[PDB]
């Protein structure tokens, strides 16, 4: 039960073609501009190719949690996770760190920056 074609009231149509496993591989808009996706073994998207050749890449964690994201250029943002599975820290391109401290139930308590403000 997957949609192959969608039609707007004006008549313009959106086209989708899938992988044999059901994962979306490409989408096409009314203007003809295409978008491409690559899916990993576990069904998690790892590369996006938009029009004009722009490419984004990603790395995923074994528990289904994003680790590294890259933009059109080589400018990564990275993530770090705690034992309970929450977002402990976030690292930007320049290397600045932002830290978070949660509760046992996951309820946020404090947020903190590199400059020291909290």
Rule CB under 8 A: say whether 10 interacts with its own copies: no
Rounded to a whole number of angstroms, the minimum distance from the CB of residue 88 to its own copies is 8
Rounded to a whole number of angstroms, the minimum distance from the CB of residue 83 to its own copies is 12
Q: Which segment (16-24, 31-39, 64-72, 110-118) binds its own copies by CB under 8 A? A: 110-118
Query: CA-CA distances (angstroms) from residue 23 to 34, 54, 79?
Result: 16, 21, 25
8 A C-beta contact, residue 26 and residue 37: yes
Judged by CB, which is closer to its own copies: 38, or 99?
Answer: 99
Query: CA-CA distances (angstroms) from residue 5 to 14, 32, 85, 109?
Result: 6, 14, 38, 46
Rule CB under 8 A: say whether 118 interacts with its own copies: yes
Is 61 strand, coil or helix? Answer: coil
Q: Tell me which of 101, 111, 113, 114 binds its own copies, using CB under 8 A.
A: 101
């Amino acid at each position: 039960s997957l949609p192959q074609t969608l039609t707007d009231p004006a008549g313009e149509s959106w086209h989708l073609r899938y992988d044999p496993r059901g994962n979306c591989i490409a989408e096409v808009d009314p203007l003809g501009q295409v978008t491409q996706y690559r899916h990993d073994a576990h069904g998690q998207v790892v590369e996006i190719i938009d029009a004009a050749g722009r490419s984004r890449k990603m790395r995923w964690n074994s528990s289904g949690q994003l680790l590294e994201h890259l933009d059109c250029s080589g400018y990564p943002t990275r993530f770090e996770y705690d034992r309970r599975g929450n977002v402990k820290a976030i690292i930007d391109a320049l290397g600045e760190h932002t830290r978070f401290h949660y509760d046992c139930q996951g309820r946020l308590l404090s947020s903190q920056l590199a400059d020291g403000r909290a």
